[PDB]
């Protein structure tokens, strides 16, 4: 039972209210998705290394970011190699309880909105029916989280890491 | 090693 | 990115004022998202998150407000691996071969014909971190039969980041904020400035996760390649991976293996102000410089500050001197709100007159053997207010000129650590022809663009929303703007449109203070909440930013319910 | 590029009709420039040059008219070199070390600080041509201790091209035109179609400079590396430099060494029609295919023709059958002028109904587990005339859709050489989900571009002159357009704007015939004469192209001086 | 002995050059081309001479798309210097008939005439007229350009790859 | 030689 009250004020600013961390996550993930689904859905393709599957290997990243705009194939390789299951595990293993719940709630909240966008409505006409608008996992959020830490190091050398090969 | 061939990468996060 | 922390001495009230001004992406997943998190007995925080992030990165609660600017501190290093003969996937470590762990990865790739096939390869790790192709940096740095290179990012082993923002979100005073930062030493790539309720001092720090090498170590560990490429990677430890004495050190108060100890990281408390505009820790406060920290945090007074940094501190001093045109001499919430949007242009204020005096008499020129009439240009720039406000005329001319001025031997008065705000200066009379060249080009570029030389900035600098062009103000740091609205679009391709993927610009802004009634906060999210063009929150906030109307964000329960646009709803689900 | 030559049987008149339609750059130094050269008693020729070229490349005189399309015949080869051990700049020629020729070159380069400094590197030539770095093609193809690569282009030693065009400019009949082409064998990378006054047959030929290799050579000289990479370089000879036996051959009637001899190069004369749309010589005329020419020229009956090629020949046949909706059954100048702008869309004409029948029943879908409303999409397309005209409604939806349909087993009826225009055909019933997926995406792209699904193409496809968007017609080859107006701009980037640097599109166009009174030419220079936005000739020609009003270009002195916009001036100076 | 061309312009500005000889024809044709397209042409002679990097910076891409694609200025300069060398120009010119050599001589002179005009004043070509890469050219330069047009099918397509071919 | 690392170049003139 996740449960959050979403209060919107001027300019749409959401004010999530919940009795626990997981439910706060649930509200926050929902509103972010509600307002920014196409960017977010594209983003999880990035962090998972699943861009080339949907958008082709040679196409560049759609959006700029601390990752720059490398080719999809190289970005995919970079994220899989560096943000691997092991790294995600090691990340998660070092988290407090409430944060782990928050992230659970966040993914489920995001996933709630995806189901809603798939059902209908005129929001996000740009991507609402694309295969890459799809549910995500707590671990995928953790991928994103880990990725935001790498801005000052590994992110700058994504192409370079994805192409490190012996003679 | 030829310094002339050095291509410096961008190192400013956000720039 | 800019930020100010003013102490009670500067504000002349019970608490200080915090100004948070990250210059950041307008689109993509790293873009900011404004929201409030109210958790029963746990947290009540408001501010901003990257899309996909669940805790507030920059913002405030009932007790503390803070922001971040990108720090000059290098967060990575290279390691030169001496390969084993015949075994190019193994590197020597103190005489003994050590095998690089492989990972065989397969990525599905959509082909230009529709079908989906696999592309596969096998990438590698050293114990330092992933292997890295550096042929792009320099051809000689290729993964050879003899040598290879690995990169390390201390944040790769940094797992305390989310907890830290989580705890800041809950923090109950400035002293608690400070202690969390000191406890966690986790902040990955940013400076931090904070102000607290009933706390006289404002906080600056570059305390976080930072590679740990000694000056002794860098003298003994930098390889010939590291020496050769050293200037392209300033303060980046390019060390020998073969010797274990070159491994990153760990101090007695070091929170993480290979990171710097908490007491050897720069911080400062001032009751007047701390500020930062992307230069090093050095000049957190102009009156009391910080010196004597590890090389890796960047130059402490051995480098010219950027024009933006000079603009930033100047603004802060002249506010407190009461010489900036604004009322009084205090950095109050209300004044700070106006001040940070004023769109002053350092290069213009400091060098325009010298340039105009040097090249405008006479105004008909010979440039590359060609007659150029620069009377209109000269006159328009003379008349211009040295600002990038919506109705400033000629500001774009200056942008196209200044960014083209060759910087070699430009100033005759070199940088002086004693006078970091006014040095370098003195436009070189020997640069007259190059300046004429640059100006000639500027006149042409504006000419192609179809804007008049005296066009108001508002018609050149704009965001489009709902089919209409909202006039904008500000510019790029290169011209020495503090207010940042910095298009990636060439002036000839439809003006300085902000509709694409502009350069790091004003994104989430906040002015936070703590009067007796409780935390007050005024905010902007310049590109607006929503990336959907159908959303009513795609362009509302941008309209406000264009008009310069700060949004007083409701924070208390009565404020949220009392808001004129209040709508509530509830979402629930199992597990 | 497209071209037609229509014979006297196809026109009805005493002379034929020539249609020149190269698809070429709209900006840059290779763009066409329209002009007439009149040298007293030596030459009177009109047409078009690349900027920088002094003679007419595509045009006409009082006797002949011609055009060009890029040929499928490869004009270069690679040569693999077996390097001398110890000496990576020497290669073996039948067990004999040969020195490569070095060249030490310095290039001054402006550094982004202003100053200009020298950058030098030594490059090399083999007896085949310049050394080439093929690591980009595949990393295993680097210049190593034992292996290196040169590239040979036959035009490297072809100094006859400019002499040829000049001679063509002066030619007094088709016969002489053809004779010139045979003597010179110089045409570097294009087909040629010409029609002559008082000649019944239109002319087609891929007679130019082409690398000469035998079938025996191909299978015996291709190196292991050549084998491994052949598929990325179809028909390109990748030979073993080591062996003299692997040098390009010389025929008894070869004009150049290493070049294919004249008699073994494809040509055809027809009194009905010849045409090319960038496929091989094979289908120069649908009724009388050409075969047996050397493999380097491309496939002759084993490959499907492009949708644009199928559209082009369909247009020719239906004109002469009198079944294309124009008057009569003759390819007269007036009628050809219409049909080549007609903007028929082959993919639509052939497959739209099949597609809609299959996926619009019902018009409410589930795609990727998401509800999609395709009532509007389905009904707009069903109502659409399958053309890319200014007032065509829905045409852009089809573009966005068709170009996203996966081609893997899309057609149930495969290519047949005996039905080259109508195969492949028959939409695979199984493709239904792939088709709905592609349509969903198309709906979304047009959605976020801000255009309505039934928007008139004129508003989507445009060229801007004098601040107003001139409506355009046509599209891209990929969709099966013949009339080519192919933007590089994504529809979400303000529609299919033609203002940047579009993909190869209609540029110079001519419709030339020879009535009794003398040559008549109708022309377009779609982008206009002058790249200067200030020039009176930056947008006039483009305005006429938008309106589809062909310029009758004056040719005789009387026509020139009689022209409403007649201006004359004479320039002179010493030699 | 002087170049002399009559330039007749009609609708759409289409120029009809009338001249007594081939040299003078070249002269008028060179002139009208520059007069309408100076900026593109001037930029383009930097390309064929391999002088892009000195004016525009080595790391920038070619301004305009063409048969050459858009490599980095530095690579483009090396390609043209290496492939369209003096010897190559010498070999190209040796093959030409006298009238063409003359026409190209005229073409250069006519182009140069317009450069003198544009440098002197006027509002045409406001975008580039003051720039240093707007400069007179030689007959040999026009021959570079002519030679470059032929390479479209082979060398032009591998310009960057030819500019970076060196041993280990 | 790995065929999967082959990057086909621009071959159609124009």
TrEMBL record, chain E:
Top-level taxon of origin: Bacteria
Disulphide bonds in the chain: 39-128
Protein name: Protein related to penicillin acylase
Full-sequence range covered: 35 to 202 of 806
